[PDB]
Each structure stands twice: as C-alpha cells, then as structure tokens.
C-alpha cells in the first residue's frame, strides 16, 4: 500500500530543532511517503542503516532522475551535467579529475591561510567595535576567499553571484521563475570567465579543468561549466551557513563553548559532532531511483520510486547513537552521514572539515567572550538552514 504522503519537508527554519515527523517517521515500521511541491511522491528513509543504503547501494540511481519527474522544493530542474547526476561510469571519470583539487592532501596547504584570514577578519570586528554581525563579517568571507582563489573566480563578484545564489536556493512561490532565470544569468557569468581563463590561463581550478577538457578531452564544455556552477556555489553558500549555526550551538548550550575553550585538541571531533547534530538543508538529499526491486527497512521500494534521504534524521537515529539529541562533542565513532556516505559522498568534505575548524579555533582564541547580541535572522523558504544575520557581542 501507500500510506498518506505527508506534506514535506517539515521545517522549521529558526534553531536546530528537527521537526517530530520525523521521529514519529524513524519509529514507523518501513518508509513513510512524502509530497515535495513539485514533482512526484517518493518514500522517505529517515533511519540510520536505511539512509546508507539509499545512499551506497549501487541498487540506486541517481542518473534516472531524468526519466522522472523528481521530487524537489524548487519548480526548476536545471538537470546539470554534474556528477552528482549521474552514476558511474560517467561520475567516476567527473570525480576522479575534480577530486584531486579537494582532498586532505591537497588543502592542508590552505589550513594557514584560512587561519590567517579569520585572525584579520576577527581583527577588523574588534576594531570596528561591537555589534558585529557573524555571518556578512566572518562567516561569509571565509568560505568565499577560499572558493573564489581555489576556483578562479574574481573575489569582488560576490555579491553579483551571491545575489544569484539566493534565488537560485529559493523556494518561495512567489517569483517562481527568478530560479531559472537567475541561473542563466550565472551561466552567462561563469560562461565569460571560462572563456578568459582558456583565452590566458591562470593558476586555479577552472584553468586546470579547462586544460583536462581541451588538451585530455576528459570533459565536455557543458561539464565544465555546471561543475564551476555547483562548486562556487557549494564552496561558498555551505560552509557560509554551518558556520553560525556551529557557533550558535556552541553557544546555545555554553558548556560546549567552554569545553573547547578548555580542550582546544577537542575541535576536530566537536566538528564532526556539529556536522552530525546541525542540519545544513532544510529538505532530504536528492532522490535515489531502484534500479531493480529492493526491500529498504521492511518497505519494498518499487522498481522506479523515488527514495529520498533524511540525513539531520539519520544523523539523531537513536539506534545508531546514543542520546541522538544531545551534543556531545566527544562523541567516538560519530560516523555520521552529514557529508552523505559512498559513490556521492561529499568532494569538499576536507575542505569544509578545514574551514570549520579554523573557523571556530579563531573565534575561541580571539573572542571567548562571545555572545549573542540581537535577534538571529534565520533562513527561511530556502533550501539550506542558518542565520542569515547573526548579531554578536564580546
Ligand atoms: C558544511 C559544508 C558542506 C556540507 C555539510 C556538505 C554536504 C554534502 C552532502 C550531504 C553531499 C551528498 C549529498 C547526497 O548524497 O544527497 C555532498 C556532496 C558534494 N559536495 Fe558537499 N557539503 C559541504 C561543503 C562542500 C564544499 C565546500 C564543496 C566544494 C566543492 C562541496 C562540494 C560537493 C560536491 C562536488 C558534491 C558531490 C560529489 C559527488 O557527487 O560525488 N561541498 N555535500
Ligand atoms: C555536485 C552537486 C552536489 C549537490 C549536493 C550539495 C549538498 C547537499 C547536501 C544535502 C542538502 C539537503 C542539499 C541541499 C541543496 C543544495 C545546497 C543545492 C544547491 C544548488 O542547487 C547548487 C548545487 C546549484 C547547482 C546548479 O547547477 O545550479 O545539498 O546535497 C546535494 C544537493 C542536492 C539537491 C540540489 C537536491 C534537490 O533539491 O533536488
Ligand atoms: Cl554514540
Ligand atoms: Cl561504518
């Protein structure tokens, strides 16, 4: 049968509450169903064990996307030459060629730059003097000096591409079309600096991809582009958001706060616990597609249905962690799925690994004091989380 698609996703938008449907979800035997605003229903997977296997089995597509009209928040499906729409072979030779610019070994070299950046930026906080806001005066330029230098895109363009990432994330009814219509603002954007860099070459990412597809013919021009699309705006929007909601949890309960105050060689695996604990979307991952008939947490997923991946609901399955819904940023073993798990786990992971603890180190040494200081503008009828202004004190 079809049990009632519930209306999704759930929200909210303010805090890092997790709605109880999706608790009442993780305790319903086999997989609930969903209706997204556009597109067709799918089930839900909310458990542990069965969001891994959504997301690991080759069983799963993400290619066959396109021969359904997919659940999703947002009216426009860009259907982007990007790995992550497509399984392998085609995502193996597209992650194989990107990756090397994202692993461990590749920006360790970045950690004293980051470092760097955050002490100058905490500097000019001081400077100016309390208020701060936490996300235009630190969060944002972090991620964005990164992503901009690593790919190849001018720095002071921010808010030109910034102002098309927010439509492009939107899923506001009204203006149903400033998606789709922004986005081929971006092409255009993107499509000039592409010409430039292969015109006279330079040392970034696009450069060198440019080189992969006109001298090794490893990619198409279509490729090329969505892939500087999706990693300018993941480089810079993600690690933007986690930022203040990481901080604003650690200052929420400020007992964390003061742990690493104390215990600084805690950072690495408090972040790993924020990533678990603190939703970045405000959705499920994109929709997997059964090739065959499979039976995912007593539910016999249909050959052909969508399967969508609650990660935040993964991440507190009781089942796999112990006391899901509390911080503990000691936690061993935090395997979680906050970065996915398998074929598409997340490229940038080092990278975000990276900011975030730098991010964090800087505020702890410079600013222990820290402290709210006005209301917390979240984001709202977006498809990630986090204050959009976040007022600060010292
Ligand atoms: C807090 C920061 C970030 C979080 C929480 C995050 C999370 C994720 C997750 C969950 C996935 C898999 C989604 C799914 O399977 O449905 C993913 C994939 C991906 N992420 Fe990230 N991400 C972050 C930052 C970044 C950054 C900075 C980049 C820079 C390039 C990036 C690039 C990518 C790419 C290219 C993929 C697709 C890889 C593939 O399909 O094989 N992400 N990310
Ligand atoms: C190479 C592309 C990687 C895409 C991942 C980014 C991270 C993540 C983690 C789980 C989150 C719930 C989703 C939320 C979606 C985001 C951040 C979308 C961003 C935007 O669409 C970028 C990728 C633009 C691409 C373009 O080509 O215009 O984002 O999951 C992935 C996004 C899934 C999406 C866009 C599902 C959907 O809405 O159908
Ligand atoms: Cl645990
Ligand atoms: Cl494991």
């Known amino acids: 049968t079809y049990p009632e698609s519930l209306s999704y996703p759930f929200g909210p938008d303010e805090g890092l509450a997790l709605s109880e449907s999706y608790t009442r979800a993780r305790d319903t035997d086999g997989l609930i169903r969903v209706k997204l605003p556009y597109g067709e229903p799918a089930w839900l997977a909310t458990r542990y064990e069965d969001a891994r296997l959504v997301l690991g089995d080759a069983r799963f597509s993400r290619a066959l996307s396109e021969e359904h009209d997919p659940p999703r928040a947002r009216k426009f499906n860009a259907q982007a030459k990007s790995m992550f729409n497509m399984d392998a072979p085609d995502h193996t030779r597209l992650r194989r060629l990107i990756s090397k610019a994202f692993t461990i070994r590749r920006v360790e070299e970045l950690r004293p730059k980051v470092h760097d950046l955050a002490h100058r930026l905490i500097d000019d906080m001081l400077a100016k003097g309390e208020p701060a806001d936490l996300v235009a005066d630190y969060a944002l330029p972090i991620p964005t000096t990164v992503i901009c230098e690593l790919l190849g895109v ?71 582009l969505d892939h500087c699309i999706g990693l300018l705006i993941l480089g810079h929007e993600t690690t933007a958001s986690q930022i203040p909601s990481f901080v604003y949890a650690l200052l929420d309960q400020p007992q964390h706060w003061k742990r690493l105050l104390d215990d600084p060689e805690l950072i690495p695996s408090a972040v790993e616990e924020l990533f678990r604990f603190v939703p970045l979307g405000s959705g499920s991952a994109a929709p997997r597609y059964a090739r065959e008939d ?56 080092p990278l975000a690994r990276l900011e975030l603890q730098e991010a964090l180190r800087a505020l702890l040494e410079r600013l222990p004091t820290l402290k709210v200081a006005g209301d917390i503008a979240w984001k709202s009828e977006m498809m990630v989380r986090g204050p959009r202004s976040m007022p600060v004190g010292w």
């Not at 994330?169 to 149903?176: A, G, H, Y």
Request: aromatic share 4%.
């Open 154 to 224: 001018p720095f002071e363009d921010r808010e030109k591409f910034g102002r098309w990432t927010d439509a492009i994330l939107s899923t506001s009814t009204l203006n149903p079309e400033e998606g789709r219509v922004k986005r081929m603002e971006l092409v255009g954007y993107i499509g000039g600096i592409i010409a430039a860099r292969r015109a006279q070459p330079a040392d970034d990412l696009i450069s060198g991809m440019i080189e992969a597809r006109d001298v090794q013919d490893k990619l198409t021009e279509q490729e090329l």
């Open 294 to 349: 499979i039976e995912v947490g007593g539910t016999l997923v249909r050959a052909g249905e969508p399967v969508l991946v609650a990660l935040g609901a993964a991440n507190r399955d009781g089942l796999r962690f112990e006391d899901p819904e509390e911080i503990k940023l000691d936690r061993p073993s935090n395997h979680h799925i906050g970065f996915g798990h398998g074929i598409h786990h997340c490229l940038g992971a």
